[PDB]
Design a protein around this ligand. Structure first.
Ligand SMILES: OC[C@H]1CNC[C@@H](O[C@H]2O[C@H](CO)[C@@H](O)[C@H](O)[C@@H]2O)[C@@H]1O
Length: 349
């Protein structure tokens, strides 16, 4: 078929499975959330928590699907249909090394639900405690071993792909051991080889040798808020793509529809980026496509705490809070607008 509705398998959408309900999970997990203290504020801060009640959840927006459980099969079905609507072929799943049965259950349910809709799943390896190249290798082995035969397990030209959040917290001399073909614990040329995509944060002076010395296969930028880092400043993307091409690296810029996290980080107002009826999303996606990249990542499907979600949101006013919503756009606007941009990306790919 050539209908302009097919999934794009070089479009990665960051997905969070950490939401719970009392009924399914024992608590309204993540809908309830600690309010972060101001890093530059008082020492006697008692910031408190967002309770995760119907009236007060840990987001400046409100989900169309309500306080959902990420463990709910019928929620997962609806999410996969939303991915199909958005034409986002790859779900990039947050992964925290929780080593707990409830997470194992969610990962299998997600894989299964994804496959029914021909969606692929890769892992977004988060900064778990004492994360280091050795336990990273052990975890990569476990993930490939356990899920590598699942039909929804993502591969690019035969290789799995991982995004590594806050990769800069690990020295390139450690990365080399895992990622150089000559490294003492290398995955190169093994059954566990993978495209490893590190987080480009700051200036090229720092990031270029980091990426090269660490032997990452590519880089992404994550942050939905333009200007937050050098990497998340879209006017740098043409130059970043040029460098990537010259150095055999895969650049996967991250685009998002907006940013606001002030429910959980009330001191963080300067990082707010307004949606302006979709214009912000359009401007950022336009810049990625114009940089001539081979792949694009979307921040995010459902990071509700940070207001970067494309998942449908609805107007809601409670006695506790008046939520933001999609203004003059329908709840599914960001899904259908994503499909539009995917079309434009494919057109110039
Ligand atoms: O997935 C990458 C990155 C995206 N932003 C949130 C990061 O997780 C932190 O912040 C969450 C609230 O937004 C919080 O619930 C997590 O525990 C973590 O502090 C995530 O690593």
């Amino acid at each position: 078929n050539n209908l302009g509705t097919e999934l794009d398998y070089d479009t990665f959408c960051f997905y969070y499975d950490w939401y719970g309900s009392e009924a399914i999970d024992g608590q309204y997990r993540h809908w309830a959330h600690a309010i972060a203290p101001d890093p530059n504020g008082g020492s006697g801060q008692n910031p408190g928590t967002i309770p995760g009640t119907q009236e007060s959840i840990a987001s400046n927006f409100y989900p169309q699907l309500g306080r959902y459980s990420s463990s709910d099969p019928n929620i997962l079905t609806k999410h996969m249909d939303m991915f199909v609507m958005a034409r986002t072929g790859v779900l990039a799943l947050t992964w925290w090394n929780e080593q707990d049965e409830t997470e194992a259950k969610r990962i299998g349910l997600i894989l299964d639900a994804a496959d029914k809709k021909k969606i692929k799943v890769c892992f977004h390896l988060e900064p778990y405690p004492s994360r280091n190249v050795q336990n990273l290798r052990e975890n990569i082995v476990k993930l490939i071993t356990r899920y590598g035969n699942h039909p929804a397990f993502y591969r690019k030209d035969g290789k799995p792909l991982f995004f590594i959040y806050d990769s800069y917290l690990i020295e390139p001399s450690e990365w080399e051991k895992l990622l150089s073909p000559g490294g003492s614990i290398t995955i190169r040329n093994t059954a566990y080889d993978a495209l490893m995509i590190g987080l480009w944060t700051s200036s090229p002076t720092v990031q270029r040798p980091f990426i090269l010395n660490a032997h990452f296969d590519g880089f992404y930028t994550y942050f939905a808020a333009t200007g937050f880092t050098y990497g998340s400043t879209p006017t740098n993307w043409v130059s970043m793509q040029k460098w990537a091409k010259e150095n055999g690296k895969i650049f996967i810029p991250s685009v998002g529809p907006g940013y606001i996290d002030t429910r959980i980080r009330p001191w963080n107002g300067s990082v707010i980026r307004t949606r302006t009826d979709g214009q912000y999303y359009d401007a950022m996606y336009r810049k990625a496509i114009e940089a001539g990249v081979s792949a694009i990542s979307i921040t995010s499907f459902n990071e509700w705490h940070e207001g970067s979600q494309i998942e449908p949101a609805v107007p809601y006013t409670s006695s506790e809070f008046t939520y933001l919503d999609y203004e003059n756009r329908e709840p599914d606007y960001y899904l259908t607008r994503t499909a539009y941009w995917v079309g434009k990306f494919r057109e110039s790919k």
